[PDB]
Design a binder for this molecule. Structure first.
Ligand SMILES: [Zn+2]
Ligand SMILES: [Zn+2]
Ligand SMILES: [Zn+2]
Ligand SMILES: [Zn+2]
Lengths: 49, 48, 299, 261, 157, 68, 50
């Protein structure tokens, strides 16, 4: 890792969570962590099935 | 088990007292400057 | 618009605002209060507001679908209870070898039915017959005028049902034969012996009857389950509910016979005590009587 | 007015009384994307509709009457609408005032708002084509709808005349005893589109009938779009009404050139 | 600081036991509203999401009228109710503004959610909607907004 | 002309996920494409969940979420 | 009619370009003018050597 540095490019201004926040199709709240883990297991099961 | 679904947060998890976490007892005369805020979620978050 | 007008026009809204206008099965509740195990449940057809439940303590407690009233007057355990549709009369039958009529108006015993040899286990009432059918360990169906005794299969009759058209009386016994009865001739119309002790029967509200045995539940005009070890109720949707001695509650669709869901009720504050003794459905709700002494409502 | 505008629309089916969204099981496992059954042999998969439109009973003012809705409620026609007077779409039989609002809109889509198609479906069912202004319905499946009652030949036609007359103005009704099917032609296309969805999968049992308790067990009757009438007694009628439509349009069209000059 | 009573969480101040039966009734209605009542209509399913946004508004109006209007609870209790998520900090922060007195919710004023750079139509006064529909000769076609089923949050009505 | 994101209640998310258990109606045909077109974004949701995992000295942890 | 043309805010999860499929199209040829094949006339004598 020290011998081969991979430097980050500066023009990457579009992050994923920031550009989805700008869309009307994503809303925001605060929930528990274990609640958000159980949703992502339920959602990710619903995706693959 | 893989047959039972992931049980819902609200019917099962949210109603119960959690449990004690892993916390060292933090002797008061030797650790008095950190013992009030060491095991917070974000320590000293609202201290200006 | 003026401020006094806008103050007046905002009082036209039905609510206060901002929302005022300008224009499977699960256990919902449990009920306590029965001293001993509740054998049978009866529902009022006219409104569905109250349930009359028999108990092993011999008292009949009327429960609002709170405790409205208590009906005593039997010496022995009540094994069946029936509520008439045309008449405001309740027919209860117990282990005291008597079928006692109840006037719902005054809450007093009006009549007692006689001549049963041994304890009555069943009562069925049609509005159109103006007759009551009582069956027992006597093994013979008695047609009582509110007259005909049906000499029957040898063994004790577990359940009885009554329908308006022909093959009116349906009988089930511990010998595992189910008979369709022609009451006018007083002989059997048909004998169905496909059961291998029939513990329950429910009439679909399709002109058909569900027949329940220890391991197999069949429908006569076959349901697939694992071993369920012994009451049946038919919802109007066509769903079929099966009680289990193991506390497992087997729900099935009657058209396909596939069992969609199985659930086990929590016992109480012994393990063997949790069966479902009897179950019924309102005229979207399921009312079930446990032998431990609790009535649980299912939504 | 007295039948429709006096009252409000009423809830036909309670939302708990609505049918289950999963179909009747004709397979081994249920498919979640395509809401159907997969590992199955076959099935007729057509059943008698449990619900029916009582037209003089259920019609009334709705939310879409006050909003200026152009489009009729689909589940009003099926007798299944759970919203009742809170529903965004209209709850009444199409009238000359209603179809005159739809006159710009009827060219591409039906009275229910559903978009029409280039060519017809293979079995002449569905919504319809915009290339043909078809106003005639194929009433089929009468044997299943009757529940197999013999019913004579004239009586089956009389039942078709009674039910489809409540659904709008009728041009003609022809029943064919040999083919065991009827052909109902309406004055407007919007009444044919309404009566197609209204009488799809229905019965003709007329409850004084013995079967009325077994109306659900049957197959149901097919109302699909009709083909062209092959006889030259009616073919010559078609070019005559197309001639009269053409002369009524040329008078309208020379006035457009009169304004244009 | 969370919703869950953890051991990092601070015990409630003095006036909490008087208002706790009123806040429990909002809490059991929100548990009955999230109950997964299976409904096949999209017109009915968002109407069940509309009932939650009403109960979130009404639980926050109650804590707003205790502290700001009638001054019935202390500031230390009111800060505890915000940190324990009993009250919406940023929706109460709009009720203090002049045009946003009876504000429907924070979503119905977002200029970025809408296709225009506009608020929801339930922010518009009803007398304005009656006037524009009077010129068209029709009744007003708005009944309930799609975000939370409001019927007018404008402070004048 | 930028106001920040509106901070929905927790139950609003909770009702949606309970409602999308049995997606059998015709109304869910658009939402099934949303479940299917989100699968490429799912590894990013696992990285954000596992990095915010509670440390052993915490009973519970409230995290700020973004949801479709 | 002066008509403002705007774009809809696309759902990042629904597939953009809903009418876009991988289908195959045969194309007709637009032949309005004939192109003259401008050869020269005809050293055309040849034995059976080829
Ligand atoms: Zn409707
Ligand atoms: Zn609003
Ligand atoms: Zn709002
Ligand atoms: Zn709004």
């Amino acid at each position: 890792n020290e011998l081969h540095p991979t430097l980050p490019t500066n023009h990457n201004k579009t992050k994923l969570l920031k550009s989805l926040k700008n869309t009307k199709y994503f809303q925001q709240t605060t929930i528990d962590w274990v609640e958000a883990g159980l949703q992502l297991c339920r959602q990710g099961h619903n995706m693959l099935n | 088990d893989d047959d039972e679904p992931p049980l819902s947060y609200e019917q099962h998890i949210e109603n119960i007292e959690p449990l004690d976490p892993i916390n060292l007892p933090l002797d008061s005369q030797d650790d008095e400057y950190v013992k009030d805020w060491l095991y917070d979620s974000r320590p000293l978050e609202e201290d200006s | 618009f003026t401020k006094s007008e806008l103050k007046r026009r905002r009082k036209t809204r039905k609510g206060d605002g901002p929302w005022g206008s300008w224009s499977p099965k699960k256990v919902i509740r449990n009920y306590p209060g029965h001293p001993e195990g509740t054998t049978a449940l009866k529902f009022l057809p006219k409104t569905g507001h109250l349930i009359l439940s028999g108990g092993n303590d011999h008292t009949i407690k009327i429960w609002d679908f709170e405790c409205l009233r208590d009906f005593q007057g039997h010496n022995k355990p009540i094994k069946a209870l029936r509520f008439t549709e045309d008449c405001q009369s309740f027919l209860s039958s117990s282990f005291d070898r008597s079928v006692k009529i109840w006037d719902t108006e005054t809450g007093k015993v009006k009549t007692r039915l006689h001549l049963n040899s041994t304890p009555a286990d069943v009562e069925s009432r049609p509005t159109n017959p103006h007759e009551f059918i009582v069956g027992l360990s006597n093994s013979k169906i008695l047609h009582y005028d509110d007259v005909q005794t049906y000499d029957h299969h040898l063994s004790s009759i577990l359940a009885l049902k009554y329908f308006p058209d022909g093959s009116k009386f349906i009988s089930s016994s511990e010998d595992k034969t189910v008979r369709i009865w022609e009451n006018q001739i007083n002989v059997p119309i048909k004998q169905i012996s496909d059961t291998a002790s029939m513990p329950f029967l429910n009439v679909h509200p399709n002109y058909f009857c569900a027949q329940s045995m220890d391991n197999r539940i069949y429908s006569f005009s076959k349901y697939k389950r694992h071993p369920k070890k012994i009451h049946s109720s038919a919802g109007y949707g066509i769903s079929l509910a099966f009680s289990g001695d193991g506390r497992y509650i087997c729900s099935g669709d009657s058209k396909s016979r596939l069992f969609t869901w199985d659930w086990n009720t929590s016992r109480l504050l012994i393990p063997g005590n949790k069966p479902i003794t009897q179950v019924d459905w309102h005229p979207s709700k399921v009312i079930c009587s446990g032998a431990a002494g609790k009535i649980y409502v299912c939504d | 007015m007295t039948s429709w505008r006096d009252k409000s629309a009423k809830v036909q089916v309670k939302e708990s009384e609505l049918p289950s969204s999963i179909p009747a099981q004709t397979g081994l496992t249920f498919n979640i994307w395509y809401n159907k059954w997969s590992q199955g042999f076959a099935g007729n998969t057509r059943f008698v509709s449990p619900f029916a439109l009582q037209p003089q009973l259920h019609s009334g003012k709705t939310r879409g009457d006050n909003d200026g809705q152009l489009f009729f409620c689909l589940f009003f026609a099926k007798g299944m609408c759970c919203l009742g007077p809170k529903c965004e779409y209209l709850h009444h039989i199409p009238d000359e005032e209603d179809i005159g609002k739809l006159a710009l809109r009827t060219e591409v889509l039906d009275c229910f708002g559903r978009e029409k198609f280039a060519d017809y479906r293979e079995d002449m069912g569905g919504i319809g084509s915009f290339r043909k202004k078809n106003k005639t319905l194929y009433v089929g499946g009468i044997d299943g709808a009757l529940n197999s009652k013999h019913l004579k030949p004239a009586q089956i036609e009389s039942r078709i005349r009674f039910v489809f007359s409540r659904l709008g103005d009728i041009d003609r009704i022809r029943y064919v005893e040999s083919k065991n099917c009827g052909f109902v032609k309406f004055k407007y296309q919007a009444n044919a589109e309404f009566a197609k969805e209204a009488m799809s999968n229905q019965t003709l049992l007329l409850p004084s009938d013995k079967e009325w308790d077994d109306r659900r067990e049957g197959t149901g009757l097919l109302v699909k779009w009709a083909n062209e009438d092959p006889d030259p007694a009616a073919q010559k009628r078609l070019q005559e009404e197309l001639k009269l439509e053409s002369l009524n349009m040329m008078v309208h069209l020379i006035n457009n050139n009169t304004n244009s000059a | 600081m969370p919703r869950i009573k953890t051991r990092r969480s601070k015990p409630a101040p003095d006036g909490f036991e008087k208002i706790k039966p009123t806040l429990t009734d909002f809490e059991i209605q929100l548990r009955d509203a999230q109950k997964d009542k299976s409904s096949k209509l999209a017109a009915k399913s968002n109407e069940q999401l509309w009932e939650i946004m009403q109960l979130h508004h009404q639980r926050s109006r109650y804590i707003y009228t205790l502290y700001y209007k009638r001054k019935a609870i202390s500031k230390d209790l009111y800060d505890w109710l915000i940190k324990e998520k009993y009250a919406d900090k940023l929706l109460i922060a709009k009720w203090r503004k002049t045009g946003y007195e009876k504000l429907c919710c924070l979503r119905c004023i977002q200029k970025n959610e809408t296709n225009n750079g506009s608020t929801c139509i339930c922010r518009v006064p009803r007398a304005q909607l009656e006037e524009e529909a009077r010129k068209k000769g029709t009744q007003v076609s708005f009944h309930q907004c799609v975000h939370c089923g409001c019927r007018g949050c404008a402070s004048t009505d | 002309l930028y106001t920040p994101k509106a901070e929905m209640p927790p139950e609003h998310l909770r009702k949606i996920i309970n409602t999308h258990s049995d997606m059998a109606s015709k109304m869910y045909n658009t939402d099934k494409k949303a479940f299917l077109g989100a699968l490429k974004y799912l590894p990013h949701a696992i990285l954000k969940l596992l990095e915010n995992m509670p440390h052993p000295w915490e009973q519970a942890k409230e995290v700020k979420v973004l949801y479709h | 009619h002066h008509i403002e043309v705007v774009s809809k805010q696309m759902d990042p999860l629904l597939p953009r370009f809903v009418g876009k499929k991988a289908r195959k199209v045969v194309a007709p040829t637009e032949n309005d003018e004939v192109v003259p094949v401008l050869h020269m006339d005809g050293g055309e004598a040849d034995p059976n050597e080829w």
